[PDB]
Amino acid sequence: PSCKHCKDDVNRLCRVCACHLCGGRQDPDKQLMCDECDMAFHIYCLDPPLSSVPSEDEWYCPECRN
């Protein structure tokens, strides 16, 4: 098992190996990877939510930024 938290069950929400906010695995093209902790975040789960993926190279999540 890659992920011990969800044992890679696709019908299981997992905030560890999928979107850290909602636990969803859908839209990996819209999941930002934090350049610090490497957690994933749907742009639409962020607050505020982003309409598109930022073009800027570095992105840090609500938890790792400031």
């Binding site: 093209d29 990877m33 993926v53 930022p54 992105w59």
Partner: peptide, 5 residues
Amino acid sequence: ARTKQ
């Protein structure tokens, strides 16, 4: 930004 992709 990097995405899971």
